Design a protein around this nucleic acid. Structure first.
Ligand SMILES: Nc1ccn([C@H]2C[C@H](O)[C@@H](COP(=O)(O)OP(=O)(O)OP(=O)(O)O)O2)c(=O)n1
Ligand SMILES: [Mg+2]
Ligand SMILES: [Mg+2]
Length: 380
DNA sequence: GGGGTCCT
DNA sequence: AGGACCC
């Protein structure tokens, strides 16, 4: 009974970079974070570059590959919010998934448009983009009609994103979030597809690995494989009783429904972010003098972002990762420090973070850190 | 990697 | 505070 759209930008970081430096939009491009090419444009994907590939492999598999540094997410994050604000203008319930994916619940919009339709141009209702599995449309099936109106709205969304933000992307229209996300990637890049209900099982069985189901991640998949469960059909067919006692009642029941293409989870309004964090990874930090400097660097960056936002963070968290898996310490922020917008907030904040740091790290005995992160949360 | 979410 | 998920 729902019409959901999943919007997925084409090679997002690379797209932002190509727009920033149009001298790049004609060469194979890779966006680099440390030793990783986290994403690349479709010209590089032709030359055999894949997501999250090593720069050694990349530089060898494509020596003409242009690399730009994408460790600072500032510009990506800003464009990311322009996209979801644009979608929110179509319909206010927009759920973000990472920086480059959004779900919108179109069912009220679709119903409104259909109520405005007369007899002449309901003939007449046509699909925009691809129909998954090339299945024939039945114009007398109200479910088909509602999903086709969905595809028209999705086309308007992609058109607005291009005309207003210069961005291309894909869309998937289906009856729930799981299916919309699975179907959006069927034709890429810069294309869209709609899933009609009688093709649901074809879509779910098209998957080759159980980890390809959104909601089934690394740990869960490893567990399932441990159990002899490898195909979607294996999971569909496994004993609920055993699954429940192996993974617990909540996860087992949820993921088994997913394996049938069933997902009743609502599209949630993401709204403003609930946390701001910054991190830096490194080979080695083994002193407190370094720690403090790193933390000060991160803290400075964060205060720029708190300042921009408006709301104020009421707790701080320090996160670490030691050599050879993360640990954290948090505490409320003193009320007087919370009012800064002018003064000197650095020293009192670094004082707090260093205490947390010494709480976790025993500095009287040697240590080896490989990541540091500062997070502001509990915003008001 | 450099983010972000929610539940236990 | 830690674990699991998503990108
Ligand atoms: N461990 C990971 C996995 C993902 N990413 C980033 C790179 C991508 O920009 C985005 C997730 O990748 P997508 O699946 O959205 O793929 P892209 O948007 O990069 O390209 P496309 O959608 O065309 O496949 O988040 C990341 O930072 N770290
Ligand atoms: Mg994308
Ligand atoms: Mg998965």
């Amino acid at each position: 009974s729902r019409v959901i759209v999943h919007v997925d930008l084409d090679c997002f970081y690379a797209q932002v970079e190509m727009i920033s430096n149009p001298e790049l939009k004609d060469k194979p491009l890779g966006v680099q974070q440390k030793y990783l090419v986290v994403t690349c444009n479709y010209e590089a994907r032709k030359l055999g570059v894949k997501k999250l590939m090593n720069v050694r492999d990349a530089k060898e598999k494509c020596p003409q590959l242009v690399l730009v540094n994408g460790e600072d997410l500032t510009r990506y994050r800003e464009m990311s919010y322009k996209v979801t604000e644009l979608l929110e203008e179509f319909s206010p319930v927009v759920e973000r998934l990472g920086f480059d994916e959004n779900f919108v619940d179109l069912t009220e919009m679709v119903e409104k448009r259909l109520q405005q339709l007369q007899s002449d141009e309901l003939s007449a209702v046509t699909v925009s983009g691809h129909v998954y599995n090339n299945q024939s449309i039945n114009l007398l099936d109200v479910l088909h009609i509602r999903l086709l109106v969905g595809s028209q709205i999705a086309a308007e969304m992609r058109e607005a994103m291009y005309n207003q933000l210069g961005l291309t992307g894909c869309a998937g229209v289906a009856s729930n979030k799981l299916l919309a996300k699975l179907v959006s990637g069927v034709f890429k890049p810069n294309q869209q597809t709609v899933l009609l209900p009688e093709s649901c099982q074809h879509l779910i069985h098209s998957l080759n690995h159980i980890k390809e189901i959104p909601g089934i991640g690394y740990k869960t998949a490893k567990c399932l494989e441990a159990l002899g469960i490898n195909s979607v059909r294996d999971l569909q067919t496994f004993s609920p009783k055993i699954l429940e006692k192996e993974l617990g009642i909540s996860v087992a029941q949820r993921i088994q429904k997913l394996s049938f293409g069933e997902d009743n989870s609502p599209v949630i309004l993401s709204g403003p972010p609930q946390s701001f964090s910054e991190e830096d990874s490194f080979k080695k930090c083994s002193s407190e003098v370094e720690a403090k400097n790193k933390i000060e660097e991160l803290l400075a960056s964060l205060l720029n972002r708190v300042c921009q936002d408006g709301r104020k963070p009421h707790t701080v968290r320090l996160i670490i990762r030691r050599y050879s898996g993360r640990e954290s310490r948090q505490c409320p922020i003193p009320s007087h420090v919370i009012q800064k917008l002018n003064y000197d907030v650095m020293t009192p904040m670094v004082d707090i973070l260093m205490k947390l740091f010494r709480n976790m790290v025993n500095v009287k005995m040697p240590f080896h850190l490989t990541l540091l992160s500062v997070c502001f949360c509990n915003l008001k």
